[PDB]
Amino acid sequence: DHFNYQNDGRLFVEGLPVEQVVKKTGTPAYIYSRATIERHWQAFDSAAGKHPHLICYAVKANSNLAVLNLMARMGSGFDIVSVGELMRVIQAGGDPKKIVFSGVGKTEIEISAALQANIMCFNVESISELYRINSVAKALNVKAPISIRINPNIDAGTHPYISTGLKENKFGIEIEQALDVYKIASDLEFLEIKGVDCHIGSQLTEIAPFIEALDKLLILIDLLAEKGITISHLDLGGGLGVPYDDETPPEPAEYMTAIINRMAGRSLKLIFEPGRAIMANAGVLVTKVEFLKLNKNFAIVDAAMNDLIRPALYSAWQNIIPLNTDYQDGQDRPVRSYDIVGPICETGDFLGKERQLALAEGDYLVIRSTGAYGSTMSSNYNSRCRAAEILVDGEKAFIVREREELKDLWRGEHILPI
Amino acid sequence: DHFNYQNRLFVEGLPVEQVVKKTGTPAYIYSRATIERHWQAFDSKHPHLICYAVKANSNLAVLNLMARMGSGFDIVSVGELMRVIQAGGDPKKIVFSGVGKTEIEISAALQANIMCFNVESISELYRINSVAKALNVKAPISIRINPNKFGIEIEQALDVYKIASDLEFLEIKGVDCHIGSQLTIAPFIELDKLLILIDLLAEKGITISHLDLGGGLGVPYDDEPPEPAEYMTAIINRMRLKLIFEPGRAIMANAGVLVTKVEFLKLNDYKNFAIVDAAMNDLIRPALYSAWQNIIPLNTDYQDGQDRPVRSYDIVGPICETGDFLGKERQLALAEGDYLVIRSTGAYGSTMSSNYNSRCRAAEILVDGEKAFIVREREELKDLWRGEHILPI
Ligand SMILES: Cc1ncc(COP(=O)(O)O)c(/C=N/CCCC[C@H](N)C(=O)O)c1O
Numbered sequence: 001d002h003f004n005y006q007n008d009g010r011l012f013v014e015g016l017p018v019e020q021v022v023k024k025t026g027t028p029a030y031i032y033s034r035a036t037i038e039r040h041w042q043a044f045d046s047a048a049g050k051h052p053h054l055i056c057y058a059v060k061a062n063s064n065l066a067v068l069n070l071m072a073r074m075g076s077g078f079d080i081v082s083v084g085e086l087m088r089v090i091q092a093g094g095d096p097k098k099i100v101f102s103g104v105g106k107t108e109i110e111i112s113a114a115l116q117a118n119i120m121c122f123n124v125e126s127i128s129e130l131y132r133i134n135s136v137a138k139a140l141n142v143k144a145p146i147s148i149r150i151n152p153n154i155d156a157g158t159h160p161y162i163s164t165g166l167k168e169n170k171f172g173i174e175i176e177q178a179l180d181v182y183k184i185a186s187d188l189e190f191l192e193i194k195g196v197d198c199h200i201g202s203q204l205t206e207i208a209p210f211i212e213a214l215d216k217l218l219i220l221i222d223l224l225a226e227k228g229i230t231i232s233h234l235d236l237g238g239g240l241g242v243p244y245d246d247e248t249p250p251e252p253a254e255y256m257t258a259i260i261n262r263m264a265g266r267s268l269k270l271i272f273e274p275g276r277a278i279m280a281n282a283g284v285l286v287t288k289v290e291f292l293k294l295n296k297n298f299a300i301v302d303a304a305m306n307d308l309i310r311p312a313l314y315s316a317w318q319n320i321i322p323l324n325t326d327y328q329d330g331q332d333r334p335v336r337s338y339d340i341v342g343p344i345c346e347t348g349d350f351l352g353k354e355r356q357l358a359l360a361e362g363d364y365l366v367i368r369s370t371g372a373y374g375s376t377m378s379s380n381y382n383s384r385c386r387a388a389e390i391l392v393d394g395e396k397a398f399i400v401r402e403r404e405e406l407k408d409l410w411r412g413e414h415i416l417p418i
Numbered sequence: 419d420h421f422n423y424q425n426r427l428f429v430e431g432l433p434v435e436q437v438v439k440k441t442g443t444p445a446y447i448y449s450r451a452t453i454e455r456h457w458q459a460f461d462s463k464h465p466h467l468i469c470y471a472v473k474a475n476s477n478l479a480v481l482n483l484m485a486r487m488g489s490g491f492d493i494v495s496v497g498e499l500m501r502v503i504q505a506g507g508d509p510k511k512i513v514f515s516g517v518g519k520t521e522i523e524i525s526a527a528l529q530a531n532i533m534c535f536n537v538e539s540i541s542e543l544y545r546i547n548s549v550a551k552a553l554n555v556k557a558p559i560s561i562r563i564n565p566n567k568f569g570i571e572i573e574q575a576l577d578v579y580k581i582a583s584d585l586e587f588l589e590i591k592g593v594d595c596h597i598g599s600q601l602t603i604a605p606f607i608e609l610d611k612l613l614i615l616i617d618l619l620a621e622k623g624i625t626i627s628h629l630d631l632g633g634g635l636g637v638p639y640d641d642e643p644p645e646p647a648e649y650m651t652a653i654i655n656r657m658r659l660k661l662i663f664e665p666g667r668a669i670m671a672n673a674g675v676l677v678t679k680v681e682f683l684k685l686n687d688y689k690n691f692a693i694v695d696a697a698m699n700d701l702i703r704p705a706l707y708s709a710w711q712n713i714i715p716l717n718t719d720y721q722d723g724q725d726r727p728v729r730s731y732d733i734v735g736p737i738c739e740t741g742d743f744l745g746k747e748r749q750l751a752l753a754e755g756d757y758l759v760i761r762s763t764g765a766y767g768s769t770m771s772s773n774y775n776s777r778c779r780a781a782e783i784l785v786d787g788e789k790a791f792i793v794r795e796r797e798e799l800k801d802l803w804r805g806e807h808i809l810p811i
């Protein structure tokens with residue numbers, strides 16, 4: 001990424017010092033690198049090269065309009081999970097023909113809207129859902145393009161977590177029943193089979209499971225050919241992991257080449273739905289130290305679990321680094337071991353534990369790797385306003401989401417008449 | 419609880435099916451009577467104030483109910499301060515907790531002339547004093563004592579209470595604590611150590627006008643202890659002071675439910691799923707804490723002749739994570755299209771909700787006898803991207 005300390009000592013985001021942006025906007029603030037976003041999307045797109053492909057960015061990772069728009073300009077497709085996401089993508093100028101719609105709980109209203117926007121494909125997750133789609137397509141007199149989200153029989157002795165996740169969880173149709181449901185789809189008049197889909201998990205740090213999944217889906221495609229069902233594309237979902245702490249996942253290029261090499265001599269169109277791998281390290285969250293409480297030690301900062309929930313919800317480890325490596329204001333900064341915690345009234349409200357840091361009250365800290373599943377999971381708990389989000393381009397910073405104002409908190413609320 | 423089966427499930431005088439028919443699902447539904455009863459149970463001589471913990475449920479109508487009964491409020495942000503004022507609450511009956519209070523929040527609270535700041539750090543004393551000084555007022559204060567990022571350890575109580583005394587624009591009014599939540603009596607009482615501390619402060623010349631015992635009193639979610647009356651008694655009996663209480667959950671938890679519609683049933687030999695239209699962005703307690711929330715049908719005796727084989731279901735929402743669930747392994751008789759009611763969601767329900775997956779926040783409805791009011795309108799899609807802009811290249 002383009003978050004880089006300089007000979008100066010000061011942290012920069014592309015051409016701008018981070019301190020400079022947060023001085024205008026205040027904290028807490030999400031800050032995104034345009035260059036990092038673009039580089040990361042391209043790393044995926046290029047690596048797929050001559051093989052017929054679409055990159056359907058997973059909107060759920062970060063749905064900000066400016067962010068989406070960056071993708072839309074580069075010609076990206078989008079993977080969406082709601083009508084809210086559909087409208088976000090259209091708003092941002094994304095091509096609805098390049099939209100696939102995932103989700104186990106799609107409503108008739110959402111399916112109608114997506115049909116009327118003429119999206120590429122519905123990635124279907126239940127039998128009940130097939131009937132619903134067909135039923136809505138019928139009422140509009142169109143033909144709904146569909147894949148089935150399939151759960152391959154990944155080998156558990158080689159990928160135990162992925163394998164049981166597939167088995168235990170609400171997503172997809174188990175491969176053992178693939179043909180049966182693909183059949184039902186074929187029999188349905190207002191559906192039109194276009195593809196096969198899967199998504200095997202998230203933050204995966206190995207190529208093997210992806211390949212394993214591909215293999216079994218190719219086998220399935222072939223079995224479907226023989227049964228006189230034609231398959232125009234194969235959607236391999238997202239799930240490619242990133243370095244948060246010490247992990248070394250495959251980079252997008254390597255992940256893609258393995259997948260392409262496995263495509264051997266086929267012309268089948270490959271759809272990918274990455275989210276995290278594109279956005280995670282394309283953003284940070286900046287926060288200001290309010291107080292230090294010394295005993296265990298606490299740095300109390302102005303960001304909290306409503307701004308970033310990943311640590312509280314998943315025990316995610318997110319690196320926390322200072323805004324300057326060489327402070328020359330002569331303030332006393334004893335290195336100590338701090339829990340970094342926010343103002344919210346729960347013990348669960350923390351951003352990181354046991355960090356070795358040299359801090360004075362008033363300092364700014366940067367939480368790395370917060371570009372994915374950061375602002376999208378944010379809330380107003382404790383009636384805190386959602387953070388500003390800023391997009392940096394070279395030497396220009398643009399506010400791509402304004403900090404909420406207090407009077408927005410109770411918008412649409414009503415007291416009882418007396 | 420005025421959520422009661424009566425034929426069909428009713429909320430006070432109204433069938434639940436009737437309200438959700440107008441508003442749609444998902445929807446939070448609150449009982450006015452239950453809220454009032456629960457606040458009164460606590461209130462019902464010894465000089466006291468009940469400072470409802472806004473964080474549990476900060477909806478304006480809800481806050482207003484408390485305000486009408488003369489309640490005080492415990493707040494943790496300027497956002498909560500403004501909510502309480504907006505709902506017609508008395509700022510003189512507001513105490514302000516929180517480890518991370520900003521100068522801006524302290525200023526606003528001073529200017530609104532609140533009862534007390536429950537202080538959690540030394541640094542914070544200086545900040546308050548510093549802002550009070552700049553406004554030329556005297557900030558009323560307790561120290562939150564730990565008999566966690568929270569509080570001052572009792573071993574250092576006197577030392578910091580001293581520092582406070584030495585500060586001119588602060589004025590020591592009280593002693594405060596909050597020991598945890600969903601407790602679940604013995605730990606409460608084990609008060610004792612704070613009274614001892616008060617006395618040690620008297621001897622040091624300091625005087626303490628009030629003692630704030632926080633919230634934390636638990637409720638029945640599944641099979642769980644003390645009702646408010648009994649909790650209070652034990653505290654009174656063990657007393658003399660003016661007692662401040664900050665209950666949240668014990669007032670609101672079972673004063674509300676969340677209603678949701680079954681979209682699909684996915685059947686497998688291995689596991690079954692009811693996919694509903696509510697999710698972890700509407701109610702995060704199961705995903706975040708593995709909280710058990712009871713999930714019950716809208717009707718015990720369905721007379722539409724649909725086939726409802728009893729099965730074991732996980733109840734899950736439309737959000738794209740395995741973590742998005744509302745409850746696990748429930749024995750339920752369901753058909754697609756049925757409405758389910760998730761109980762005990764009046765506290766830490768909507769207040770922790772978000773827009774993840776670009777889902778609009780649920781409508782919230784307050785029932786009074788035979789009248790239902792929409793106390794929070796469902797968000798519209800275009801509210802999702804409020805304040806967002808694409809780059810102009
Ligand atoms: C059908 C489908 N496609 C694509 C993706 C994108 O996956 P990615 O490449 O971003 O790993 C997901 C993510 N579904 C799961 C999201 C889990 C993230 C969690 N809130 C977190 O913060 O880690 C998905 O469910």
Ligand SMILES: Cc1ncc(COP(=O)(O)O)c(/C=N/CCCC[C@H](N)C(=O)O)c1O
Nearest residue numbers: 345471515596599633634664665666667766
């Ligand atoms: C000063 C103070 N008063 C009252 C309460 C809560 O009162 P209760 O409702 O316990 O009577 C809390 C913390 N409250 C702690 C967090 C709330 C629980 C979590 N979100 C949950 O859903 O279980 C607090 O910090």
Ligand SMILES: [K+]
Nearest residue numbers: 185186191192
């Ligand atoms: K067909």
Ligand SMILES: [K+]
Nearest residue numbers: 375376773802
């Ligand atoms: K957002």
Ligand SMILES: [K+]
Nearest residue numbers: 582583585588
């Ligand atoms: K004083």
Ligand SMILES: [K+]
Nearest residue numbers: 806807808809
């Ligand atoms: K715009």
